[PDB]
C-alpha cells in the first residue's frame, strides 16, 4: 500500500549498504531481523532513528531520501524481512 515506496528508497539508497537485507559494512547488524533485532532495534522507531541519521558508519537520511521513506524505508525493512526480504 505505501511500503512500495519503501523498496523505492531502500532499492535506490539503502541498497548501496545493504542490498539483500544483508549489511554491506558490518558483519552482524543486518536488515532482516535476527541481528538488527538480536540486540534490539528492528522496530520502525529503531531503524527510523538509525536512518534519519544513520548510526556509527551509516549515512543519515533525514533529508537524503524523500521523507516518507526515511519512514516507509524503516517500516519497509519490517515488511521485507517479515516475509522474504525482496527474496
Ligand atoms: C553505508 C555506509 C550505509 C548506508 C548507505 C546505509 N546503511 Fe544502514 N547501516 C550501515 C552500517 C555500517 C550499519 C551498522 C552501524 C550500526 O547500526 O551500529 C548500518 C546499520 C543499519 C541498521 C541496523 C541498525 C542497528 O541494529 O543498529 C538498519 C536497520 C539499517 N542500517 C538500515 C538502513 C537503511 C534502510 C538504509 C537506507 C536509509 C541504510 N541503512 C543505508 C551503513 C549504511
Curated annotation (Swiss-Prot):
Heme c binds at residues 14, 17-18, 58. It comes from the Bacteria. It holds the Pfam family Cytochrome_CBB3. InterPro entries: Cyt_c-like_dom, Cyt_c-like_dom_sf, Cyt_C6, Cyt_C_IC. One of its GO terms (cellular component) is plasma membrane-derived thylakoid lumen. Binds 1 heme c group covalently per subunit. Its main location: other. GO terms for molecular function: electron transfer activity; heme binding; iron ion binding. It is found in: Cellular thylakoid lumen. Monomer. Functions as an electron carrier between membrane-bound cytochrome b6-f and photosystem I in oxygenic photosynthesis. This is Cytochrome c6.
Amino acid at each position: 500500500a505505501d511500503l512500495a515506496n519503501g523498496a523505492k528508497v531502500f532499492s535506490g539508497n539503502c541498497a548501496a549498504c545493504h542490498m539483500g537485507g544483508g549489511n554491506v559494512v558490518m558483519a552482524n547488524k543486518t536488515l532482516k531481523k535476527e541481528a538488527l533485532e538480536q540486540f534490539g532495534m528492528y522496530s520502525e522507531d529503531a531503524i527510523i532513528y538509525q536512518v534519519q541519521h544513520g548510526k556509527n558508519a551509516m549515512p543519515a537520511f533525514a533529508g537524503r531520501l524523500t521523507d516518507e521513506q526515511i519512514q516507509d524505508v524503516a517500516a519497509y525493512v519490517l515488511d521485507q524481512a517479515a516475509k522474504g526480504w525482496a527474496g
